[PDB]
Amino acid sequence: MRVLFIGDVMAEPGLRAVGLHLPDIRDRYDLVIANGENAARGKGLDRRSYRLLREAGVDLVSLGNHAWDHKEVYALLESEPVVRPLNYPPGTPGKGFWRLEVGGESLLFVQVMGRIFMDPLDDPFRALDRLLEEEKADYVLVEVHAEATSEKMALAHYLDGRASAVLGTHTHVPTLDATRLPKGTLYQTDVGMTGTYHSIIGGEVETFLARFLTGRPQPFRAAQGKARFHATELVFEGGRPVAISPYVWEEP
Template identity: 40%
Template sequence: MPLLFYNRTMKILFIGDIYGEAGVNYLLENISYLRQTYQPNLIIANAENAKEGRGITLKIYKELMKSGISLLTMGNHTWKNKELETFIEGSNVIRPINDRSNKGNGYKIIKYNDKKILVLNALGRAFMAEEYDNPFLMVKEVLEKETYDYSILDFHAETTSEKVAMAHFLDGKIDAVVGTHTHIQTNDNMKYPKGTLYISDIGMTGPMWGVIGVDKDIIVNRFVYAESVPNQVAKGPRQINAVLITLEPTRKIEKIHLEEMS
């Protein structure tokens, strides 16, 4: 892990899964407030649900980039909107490193002043619908071969056990492991024994009163009556969930929650 330089500041704002138009718009409405309040050097966001819960479009990508976001990570819905295939090359979107795609990249190095920040994206394998390559070994390989000053992994996974295992596996080898995918902000933001910062899930940016973003009645009826109705983004008040990762001059990870009044 790189040595710290205490005369510098390095803070990264990481926005949790942006869900649908509600999440995109609420983030755009509040990103200036977030920037002024937390003064991050960089902003990263998970956008695999940005287009109504299924992938991302070029229009949304451009809106998020124009707002000042530096990089977008993805997840198991990366390719659900095929438009991404037309612009991912050369973009500031990274897809999971282990999803076996031949398009795009699973990591990117962002330059900020004289520093290089390595950001990786990986999918967990427990309870996922598809077969993916081993994320532990693939992330380790990149960390060992690339040159950088700071490193962050967005681990898009279903189970807390797999996420925690990844943090232990990489403790002292990476600056931060943040979990996405389950859309519920967890209460375990902490620094691991060898210095890696961690949270099991950043949470979701989107509707407050749905079921992880989807209209609540659709999901409740699916559980209770086994009804099969396509997902629709929930309406009503919106929220932003994020974390502020501070790497210099101190090392800490703080939760952020912002919500719209009912």
């Protein structure tokens, strides 16, 4: 099977890039997965954004810690192809994984959340052991939403030979390190954000700068401008991880 994972869809720019370009390339994949944690104006996921992602060809959407920003996410999380970090404590709405079926083969998608430099949560390492224990598929893709590169790599290595591929997100900047670990698992530190980089982490330049220059609070505002579409191609065949390719498209 051929899978395309779309990195963090920011606000309008991110949504526009996906809706504008994905249709032109959907023919090339069996499944498309995209992180839509900030798909709604730069904060949370809402019904509108979700429908737009799906209409562009997205089969499954992952979140992050900005997942509870909208009340519209709960409805989505319980009846739609949407997943929040598995890493969350018991009694947390939604699912931490999703099983995708395609042409006789299955793919288990798991999103997990890093802990260093972030809010304390369940051990992502052992949460993955428990999940891989009771859930089997031909291929396993694990999204590591985290700040620390070492933590992402520690998870990749801990998952080597078990997961088919491990892709990191949340850092909003694409990495040039796509490779395969010793036991054959594909890995990339960060797929990057899809949205406009004519910003600072997707936020409005002056607003974030003021945030850094004054040390005082600043209303979050999403930047607007031409965007970039960042995703990573993954090929899985023979129960094996075959290739990983960072992809990029620019809004004319």
